[PDB]
Amino acid sequence: MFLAQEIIRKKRDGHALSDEEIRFFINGIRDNTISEGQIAALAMTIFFHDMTMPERVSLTMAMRDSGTVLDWKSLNLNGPIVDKHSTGGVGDVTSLMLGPMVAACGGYVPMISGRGLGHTGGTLDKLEAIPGFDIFPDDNRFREIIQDVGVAIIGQTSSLAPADKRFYATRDITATVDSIPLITGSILAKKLAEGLDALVMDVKVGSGAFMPTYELSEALAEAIVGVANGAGVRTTALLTDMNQVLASSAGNAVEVREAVQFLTGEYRNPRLFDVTMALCVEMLISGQLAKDDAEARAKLQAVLDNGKAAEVFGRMVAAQKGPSDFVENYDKYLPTAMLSKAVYADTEGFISAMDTRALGMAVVSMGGGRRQASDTIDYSVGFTDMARLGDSIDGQRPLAVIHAKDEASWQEAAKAVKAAIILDDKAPASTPSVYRRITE
Amino acid sequence: MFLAQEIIRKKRDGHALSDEEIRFFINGIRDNTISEGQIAALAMTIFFHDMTMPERVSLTMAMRDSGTVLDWKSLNLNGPIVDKHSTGGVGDVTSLMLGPMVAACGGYVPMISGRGLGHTGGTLDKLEAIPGFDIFPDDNRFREIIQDVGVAIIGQTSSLAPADKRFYATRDITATVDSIPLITGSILAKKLAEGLDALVMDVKVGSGAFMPTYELSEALAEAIVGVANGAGVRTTALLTDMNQVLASSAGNAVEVREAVQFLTGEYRNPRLFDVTMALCVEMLISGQLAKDDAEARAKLQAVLDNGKAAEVFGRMVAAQKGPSDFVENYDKYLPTAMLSKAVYADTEGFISAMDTRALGMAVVSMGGGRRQASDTIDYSVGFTDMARLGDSIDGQRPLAVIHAKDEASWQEAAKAVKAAIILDDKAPASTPSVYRRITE
């Protein structure tokens, strides 16, 4: 009887909440002045009754103002503050190239990222395959890197939209994760506290995605776009394919290798390129570094093709206490698995479907992802040379190369892979890697 | 690799294309193995040469076959799979009653809709005003519902006729939209992908219609009937009136409320009753659930009178995760606007005409639809108690009651409504709600 359980009653009876009520409640979530039950009751009312635009905005802005909001106006940068966020996937390495690419074109990109969640890998866990790489700089150190290099990829401190900690933790035991306005707030609060001028969202589609279906993924994308621009951050979103691994590799070191090769030009997975380039195009248009697609793409391609984006990545890595020559000598630095060999299908058809959640899970079980705070990632495990949806497969066309700690691990991943890839006699229909662009 | 410049040339030179050439080209659109120039060139040759029935049929079947086509043969249902399709309109809530009504009479009605944008609102938006109501069940749940309830209204449209995406997109920048065989394939493909035995097409006539003249509505309607039956789906079409709002309401929650009251008998707008009834009749006859018009109407009137049609809507709602007592207690669940208030005309007279698009736009401006796909809907706003053509107007008889989120939007809406409705000293003449029934 310390205060208004009144906010819950109002939403329960289908009434819109107000800016103040929302701020009040989100503040109380942080302060622990509102209990788990109360949070869970409000979540469930929101699940049933969907929030309006002003409620959605007020929810995100409240969650963003619950901790520290980064202010960049102190340094006179003469370039937009732009970021990318993804709902996650398998082989979703794009950021490693994207931040550098955008930095190379005048962008300033303070990428506060996260670690692995469930089946999806995390950018921070990938970067921590690099010896010496420090994902926790000080506010001071961070500013410097961004100012000099133009990009950095770091982990969150407790003071970044901290309301989300209690809020999400409650949702995740109360079957209240699956609500679009609550997902939107949870996604964007962290990102908007970075003090952005602009943002692109990558909302995955298909078997390895967050949402189960295209239409739901689409719905979440428009909601993010609506809310973010509502908060005063120019935003667009793309709907991208995740019915298979996006890179040709899944894991940590292997993905880092792939990122470096893409930037230099040694190898570029054409699907990974399409998605990376498009996401990049958005940041340039929204950041006012380009006025259209064509002009964005020529500036982006140029920095892929003149070595500038590779260079910025090397400098970033060095700025964050990774080696000074990581790009030049990465394979001297990245850890290697004890055991690497192809896994082969039992049939001769075309690849028809790929269960990407399960592939992601398989990488975790090998050690490529945590399940308990204390257990430490083996950074060398994962898949490379991924076969792709539509490929003809036979006795000398492997589904993947699996990198593992030992035989037993290897066998476990081998069966998981074989189980996850389904083969047809006739070729399946092509799907685009980028489905749709979404603007305000 | 597999350009189809030969196919374009053959069509260009005034030859009929074979089913196999048509399927090849459409599947090439889907898989992006055919380029936009090529799609455009073929669209133009079709605009110029038209298509024979065989070609029209091959075209829409190929678009239909380009994605998923639902198979009902297992489940052993002892009735017809049937649906309604429409060109759309303001206050056209028919689907909400028609589905339950036909399913109460023995039909199975897998109502899959597309998302509504433009001056006229969507069926899916309206249902989502019901808390809990899930427009995106998984296809296995979907078939359960069709089996247990007989009707379900969902949104999983993406994997249906996906070739239409690039086709229409292209058509829409090259002035090849306005072509009857192309329009017909586009209108019909997604709906035939439902695996229908039978279909009715509602083609609107009037100032509010997708086609501009009575003669053009009729021409479209005959083309749709010719093709659908050639495609092996028993189809008829009706021309129905859109010179004013069909229902007495326009919005989301307001239109669901009208749908429930129509099913229960609490209120039946006579114009909306005529259209709804006529459409359901066709469905019963084409579905082979009624012998003729009089039998069909007796069956429908009976499910309206004994509450069975309202019960089915209730069971549909519960199946789709809505509250199970929604029909009894809809006012408890439907969101209510902060401000609901009558708007009166600046003059006295008879209602002479109404600009339905402007009225639809007024609802959209209230928040009752999407200006852009980014936007969030406020499900509570809209119009009720709509005055109708021929009504006498003065300071005792309002134009409508406006449900707005605040006074300023109400005022905005009140101006727009007043501008949209034309009064006159002398009363206008009446027209039918339902025009020609087309069986070809």
* CATH code of the domain covering residue B379: 3.90.1170.30
- Chain B residues with CB under 8 Å of A49 CB are 131, 335
For residue A257 the two structure tokens come to 């290798």
Find the Cα–Cα–Cα–Cα dihedral B74, B75, B77, B82, rounded to 10°. -80
CATH number at residue B49: 1.20.970.10
> Strand B349-354 relative to strand B198-205: parallel, antiparallel, unpaired?
unpaired
Catalytic annotation on B341? no
In a domain, A439, yes or no: no
Indicate whether A300 and A412 sit together in one domain.
no
**Same domain as B417, residue B343:** yes
In chain A, the residue whose alpha carbon lies closest to the alpha carbon of B371 is A440
Q: Bridge-partner residues for A158, per DSSP? A: none
- Same domain? B216 vs B177: no
> Which residues 39-68 of chain A have a CB within 8 Å of chain B?
48-50, 52-53, 56
Interface contact A429-B30, CB threshold 8 A? yes
Contact between B99 and B259 (Cβ < 8 Å)? no
SS3 B204: strand
CB atoms within 10 A of CB B226: 17
Query: Is residue B440 included in any domain, yes or no?
Result: no
Cα separation values, A331 from A112, A125, A263, A386, Å: 26, 18, 15, 20
Interface of B with A in 70-109 (CB under 8 A): none
Q: Are residues A6 and A99 in the same domain?
A: no
Q: Is B180 part of a structural domain of the chain? A: yes
B280 and B406 within one domain: no
Domain boundary residue, one of B296, B313, B336: B336
Strands B339-343 and B434-438, bridge-based pairing: unpaired
Q: Which residues pair with A188 in a beta bridge?
A: none
Residues of B in contact with A215 (CB under 8 A): 136, 155-158
| Residue in the block written with tokens 């109380």 | A28
* Distance set, CA B330 to CA A229, B31, B336, B341, B384 (Å): 34, 46, 11, 21, 16
Q: Which residue bears the tokens 């509570």? A: B380
Residue of chain B with shortest Cα separation from A440: B374
On the CB side of A345, how many CA atoms lie within 13 Å of its CA? Answer: 24
Query: Residue B53 is encoded by which pair of tokens?
Result: 């029935």
CA distance A170 to A174: 6
Cα–Cα separations (whole angstroms), residue B197 to A71, A347, B194, B200: 62, 38, 9, 11
- Residue A239 φ then ψ, to 5°: -105, 120
Strands B434-438 and B234-241: antiparallel
Instruction: Identify whether the C-beta of residue A103 lies closer than 8 Å to the C-beta of residue A284.
Output: no
Q: Residue B273: which CATH number?
A: 3.40.1030.10
Among B139, B164, B124, B145, which Cα is nearest to B43's? B164
Say which of B66, B158, B333 has its CB closest to residue A14: B333
Same structural domain, A416 and A341: yes
Q: Which residues contact A212 (CB under 8 A, 6 or more apart)?
A: B138
Q: Is B392 a catalytic residue?
A: no
Neighbours of B238 (CB within 10 A): 23
Its sign, for the CA torsion A4, A8, A11, A13, is negative
A274 contacts chain B (CB < 8 A): no
Q: How many CB atoms lie within 10 A of CB A339?
A: 15
Q: Which residue of A has its CA nearest to B322?
A: A48
Contact B128 A50 (CB under 8 A): yes
d(CA A84, CA B122): 32
Q: What is the resolution of this structure in A?
A: 2.2
Please indicate whether, in this complex, the C-beta atoms of B131 and A53 are within 8 angstroms of each other: no
Return d(Cα A275, Cα B299) in angstroms, integer: 55
Calculate the dihedral angle through the C-alpha atoms of B367, B372, B373, B378, rounding to the nearest 10 degrees.
0
Q: How far is CA B423 from CA A427, B116, B241, in A?
A: 63, 30, 20
CA distances from A110 to A37, A60, A73, B358 (A): 36, 19, 14, 45
Residue B78 Cα, gap to closest chain A Cα (Å): 30
How do A109-112 and A382-384 pair as beta strands?
Answer: unpaired
A432 touches chain B (CB under 8 A): yes
Same domain, B151 and B210: yes
Catalytic residues of A: 83-86, 123, 171, 186, 190-191
Q: Which of A10, A11, A52 to mutate against chain B (most B CBs within 10 Å)?
A: A52
Q: For residues A74 and A70, what is the distance between their CA atoms, to the nearest angstrom?
A: 11
**Does residue A316 sit in the same domain as residue A419?**
no
By the 8 A CB rule, do A151 and A20 touch? Answer: no
Q: Is residue A26 part of a domain?
A: yes
Q: What is the CA angle A184-A189-A190, rounded to 5?
A: 120
* Among B32, B138, B376, beta carbon nearest to A226: B376
How distant is the Cα of B377 from the closest Cα of chain A, in angstroms? 7
Establish if A391 belongs to a structural domain. yes
Inter-chain touch A430–B30, beta carbons under 8 Å = yes
Range of the domain at A206: 70-155+194-336
Distance in Å, alpha carbon of A225 to nearest chain B alpha carbon: 6
User: Which approach determined this entry?
Assistant: X-ray
Q: Which of A302, A336, A370 is the last residue of a domain?
A: A336
**Which residue do the tokens 């300071």 mark?**
B395
Q: Do B54 and B27 have their domain in common? A: yes
Q: CB distance from A112 to chain B under 8 Å?
A: no
The vertex-B213 CA angle with B211 and B219, nearest 5°, equals: 70
Number of other residues whose CB lies within 10 A of the CB of residue B49: 17
Q: How far apart are CA A209 and CA A234, in angstroms?
A: 25
Active site residue B86: yes
Is B320 in the same domain as B355?
Answer: no
Q: Give the CA-trace dihedral at A100, A102, A105, A110, to 10 degrees.
A: -90
- DSSP, collapsed to helix, strand or coil, labels residue A434 as strand
Q: Which H or E run includes B234? A: strand B234-241
B53 domain residue, yes or no: yes
Asked whether residue A31 falls in the same domain as residue A98, the answer is: no
Distances (CA, A) of A418 to A169, A421, A431: 34, 6, 22
- Residue A215 contacts B, CB cutoff 8 Å: yes
> Are residue B227 and residue B359 in the same domain, yes or no?
no
Secondary element (H or E) of residue A38: helix A36-48
Establish if B439 belongs to a structural domain.
no
Q: Between residues 338 and 377 of chain B, which touch chain A (CB distance below 8 Å)?
A: 338, 367, 372-376
Q: How near does any CA of chain A get to the CA of B243, in Å?
A: 32
**Among partner residues A212, A226, A430, which is closest to B375 by beta-carbon distance?**
A226
The answer to the question of residue A440 being in a domain is: no
CB contact under 8 A, B136 and A438: no
Domain boundary among B142, B169, B193: B193
If one counts the domains in chain B, the total is 3
Query: Do A438 and B373 lie within an 8 Å CB cutoff?
Result: yes
Nearest to A222 among B32, B131, B374 (CB): B374
| Cβ atoms of A70 and A110 closer than 8 Å | yes
Flag if A215 and B155 touch (Cβ within 8 Å). Answer: yes
Is residue A298 exposed (0-12), middle (13-18) or buried (19+ Cβ within 10 Å)? exposed
A352 near A408, Cβ under 8 Å? no
Chain A environment of B140 (Cβ under 8 Å): none
State whether residue A186 is helix, strand or coil.
helix
**Beta strands B151-154; B109-112: pairing state:** parallel
Task: Centre a 10 Å sphere on the Cβ of residue A392 and count the other Cβ atoms it contains.
Answer: 12
Are B378 and A223 in contact (CB < 8 Å)? no
Distance between CA atoms of residues B370 and B361, nearest Å: 10
